[PDB]
Amino acid sequence: GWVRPDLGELSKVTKVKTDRPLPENPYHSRARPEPNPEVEGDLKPARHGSRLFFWTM
Amino acid sequence: MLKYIIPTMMLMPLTWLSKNSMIWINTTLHSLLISLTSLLLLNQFGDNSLNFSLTFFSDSLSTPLLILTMWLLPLMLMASQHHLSKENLARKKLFISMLILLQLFLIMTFTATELIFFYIMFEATLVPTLIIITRWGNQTAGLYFLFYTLAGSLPLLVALIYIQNTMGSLNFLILQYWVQPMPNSWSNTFMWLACMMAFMVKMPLYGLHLWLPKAHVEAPIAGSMVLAAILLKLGGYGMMRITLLLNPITDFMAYPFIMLSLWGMIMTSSICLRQTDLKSLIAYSSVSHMALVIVAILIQTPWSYMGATALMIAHGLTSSMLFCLANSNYERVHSRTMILARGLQTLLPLMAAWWLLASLTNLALPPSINLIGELFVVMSTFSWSNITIILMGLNMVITALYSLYMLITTQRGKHTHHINNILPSFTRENALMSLHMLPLLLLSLNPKIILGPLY
Numbered sequence: 001g002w003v004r005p006d007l008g009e010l011s012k013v014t015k016v017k018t019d020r021p022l023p024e025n026p027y028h029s030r031a032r033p034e035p036n037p038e039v040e041g042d043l044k045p046a047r048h049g050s051r052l053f054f055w056t057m
Numbered sequence: 058m059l060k061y062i063i064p065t066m067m068l069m070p071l072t073w074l075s076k077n078s079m080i081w082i083n084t085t086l087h088s089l090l091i092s093l094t095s096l097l098l099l100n101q102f103g104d105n106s107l108n109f110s111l112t113f114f115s116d117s118l119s120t121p122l123l124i125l126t127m128w129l130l131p132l133m134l135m136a137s138q139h140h141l142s143k144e145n146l147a148r149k150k151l152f153i154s155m156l157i158l159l160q161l162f163l164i165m166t167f168t169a170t171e172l173i174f175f176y177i178m179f180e181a182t183l184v185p186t187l188i189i190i191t192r193w194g195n196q197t198a199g200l201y202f203l204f205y206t207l208a209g210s211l212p213l214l215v216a217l218i219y220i221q222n223t224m225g226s227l228n229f230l231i232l233q234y235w236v237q238p239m240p241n242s243w244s245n246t247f248m249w250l251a252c253m254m255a256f257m258v259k260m261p262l263y264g265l266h267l268w269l270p271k272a273h274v275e276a277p278i279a280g281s282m283v284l285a286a287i288l289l290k291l292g293g294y295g296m297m298r299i300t301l302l303l304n305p306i307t308d309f310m311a312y313p314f315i316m317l318s319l320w321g322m323i324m325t326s327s328i329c330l331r332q333t334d335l336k337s338l339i340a341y342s343s344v345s346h347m348a349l350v351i352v353a354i355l356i357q358t359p360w361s362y363m364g365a366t367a368l369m370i371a372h373g374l375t376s377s378m379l380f381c382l383a384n385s386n387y388e389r390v391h392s393r394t395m396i397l398a399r400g401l402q403t404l405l406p407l408m409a410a411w412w413l414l415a416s417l418t419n420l421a422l423p424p425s426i427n428l429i430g431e432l433f434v435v436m437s438t439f440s441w442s443n444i445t446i447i448l449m450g451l452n453m454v455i456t457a458l459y460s461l462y463m464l465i466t467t468q469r470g471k472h473t474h475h476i477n478n479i480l481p482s483f484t485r486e487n488a489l490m491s492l493h494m495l496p497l498l499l500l501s502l503n504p505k506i507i508l509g510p511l512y
């Protein structure tokens with residue numbers, strides 16, 4: 001009483017209900033470095049210009 | 058200082074938009090107006106300098122140099138318009154524009170508050186001067202420029218950038234208050250020479266002086282006036298600004314160079330007794346007078362700085378008048394040979410009177426400011442060592458002799474027979490002599506304005 005599968009059936013993505021838990025770190029990846037801080041705050045003008053030897057703006 | 062830079066730059070449309078016969082009169086008139094304006098720089102105080110902005114300030118050192126610089130331009134325009142009357146009109150405007158641009162560089166060289174802006178203006182002054190000497194000079198290597206820039210300007214550049222990275226600023230007003238003592242080492246020794254040797258060549262120093270009695274001879278009259286009147290004093294101004302940072306290493310590193318000057322003012326003065334070229338005689342006299350400015354800056358006492366700034370102003374006036382007298386003879390006999398034309402008091406009495414006054418102020422006849430500067434330098438060097446007075450006094454013998462030998466050779470004796478193109482003195486020439494000498498005589502009535510930041 002076995003029906004042979006049709007064209008397209010065995011290549012389906014099925015779903016499986018397993019009792020085992022999800023592997024929370026399957027790569028055994030250690031803790032990442034914390035990223036560099038972002039920029040915040042309003043942008044004020046440069047304090048007394050370029051400060052390039054004598055240029056006052 | 059912006060009230061002086063902008064009229065100086067408005068002299069460029071005032072010299073190019075003018076008519077074909079009006080580019081001497083307009084430029085002379087408005088440059089004399091700027092020179093009359095230049096007396097507002099005398100708003101000086103006994104404690105604080107006249108600090109205009111972040112870029113510009115003018116204490117009592119730069120102020121007489123500025124007044125002399127803005128006074129020198131109409132005098133150079135009066136001097137150089139005779140022999141350029143056969144020149145093309147556009148090249149005539151080019152000459153006047155080079156003089157105006159050189160004035161523009163000088164008046165903000167002396168008022169540069171910050172030291173690398175002083176350096177850029179200081180090495181920017183050399184370009185119009187070289188254009189004037191090479192283009193409107195008379196006669197024909199070039200290794201002097203290379204030897205100048207090796208031992209001079211770029212060691213000064215690296216030195217000022219090093220001070221910029223150590224101290225944090227090259228403002229002279231900040232460096233008055235953040236100056237550190239500079240101890241004995243080899244790094245500080247080459248640091249001291251890198252700071253000093255560019256101005257040493259620009260004075261000139263003896264042994265480094267041979268560029269000047271050729272650059273004066275290969276120059277026109279305006280080039281000689283601006284060399285011996287202002288451009289040799291950029292070295293003295295730069296030294297008086299840079300010896301602030303260079304203590305107390307100077308207290309044992311000024312020992313070689315003072316020797317080169319204290320013997321140098323003996324040698325070059327004696328070289329003035331053995332000259333055939335009048336213009337080279339005035340050149341070696343300029344070297345012998347700047348040697349005392351070198352000595353007075355390097356011994357760094359207050360009387361020495363007062364004498365050195367008085368000697369700078371008085372020598373600018375006196376040497377410019379001597380070059381204009383040499384111009385007046387070169388425009389008659391067409392030869393700079395001093396023994397060629399003689400006995401010229403028999404023909405030109407008023408011009409011989411101007412020669413007499415110029416030779417009296419050359420040998421430091423009191424109460425002239427030549428003698429005031431000379432005398433204060435001799436007082437400070439007597440305080441330095443009690444033997445130098447001999448080397449001073451022997452100098453003050455010889456500085457009389459070639460001042461009067463030049464007066465005896467050209468202006469006295471039997472007149473030359475085979476020279477009959479000696480015209481009477483034009484009114485322009487006597488005007489030039491009087492505008493050189495009458496400020497130099499009037500400063501004897503009130504010398505405290507030409508005695509520097511520490512009167």
Ligand SMILES: CCCCCCCCCCCCCCCCCC(=O)OC[C@H](COP(=O)([O-])OC[C@H](O)COP(=O)([O-])OC[C@H](COC(=O)CCCCCCCCCCCCCCCCC)OC(=O)CCCCCCCCCCCCCCCCC)OC(=O)CCCCCCCCCCCCCCCCC
Pocket residue numbers: 054055056057058059062063066067069070109110111112113158165177
């Ligand atoms: C109601 C709303 C509107 C209100 C309107 C109110 C205003 C009305 C007026 C409108 C018109 C404005 C015109 C300009 C304003 C004044 C600017 C000024 O003087 O700044 C002072 C500025 C610094 O003085 P300050 O007292 O500290 O500042 C006062 C103000 O706060 C100045 O402000 P600052 O402190 O913020 O300045 C910033 C900074 C201040 O500067 C610095 O921090 C120092 C660095 C300066 C440059 C150094 C370079 C050195 C090496 C290169 C050398 C270059 C070649 C030299 C010249 C070659 C031949 C041209 O400037 C720069 O960095 C710019 C470079 C310099 C250019 C200045 C303007 C030039 C305009 C005309 C150009 C014509 C040729 C000029 C000569 C070129 C060289 C200067 O002076 C200089 O830098 C010295 C040179 C003088 C500047 C030029 C004068 C401008 C007007 C010229 C008119 C005549 C032209 C004649 C024909 C051409 C002849 C060849």
Ligand SMILES: CCCCCCCCCCCCCCCCCC(=O)OC[C@H](COP(=O)([O-])OC[C@H](O)COP(=O)([O-])OC[C@H](COC(=O)CCCCCCCCCCCCCCCCC)OC(=O)CCCCCCCCCCCCCCCCC)OC(=O)CCCCCCCCCCCCCCCCC
Pocket residue numbers: 406407410411413414417418422423424425495498499501502
């Ligand atoms: C602020 C207000 C001030 C008011 C007062 C003015 C202060 C003095 C200013 C200058 C004064 C002399 C100017 C003329 C001499 C140069 C041109 C010339 O040869 O003319 C001869 C000519 C007459 O002779 P000439 O027969 O027709 O022609 C000449 C011959 O062809 C052949 O000529 P020569 O060889 O027969 O004659 C030349 C003769 C030759 O004699 C000499 O070479 C001997 C001189 C040296 C030895 C004697 C003096 C030694 C030192 C002591 C004196 C000073 C201190 C005195 C105080 C007591 C002690 C502390 O020298 C003189 O006659 C000049 C006498 C005055 C000499 C002044 C010092 C020059 C010596 C060298 C520098 C010394 C240190 C500086 C002292 C400054 C004092 C203020 O005179 C005039 O045409 C004069 C015209 C007007 C001159 C105005 C001068 C002032 C200009 C400034 C304008 C802005 C301020 C307003 C004041 C206006 C006042 C009127």
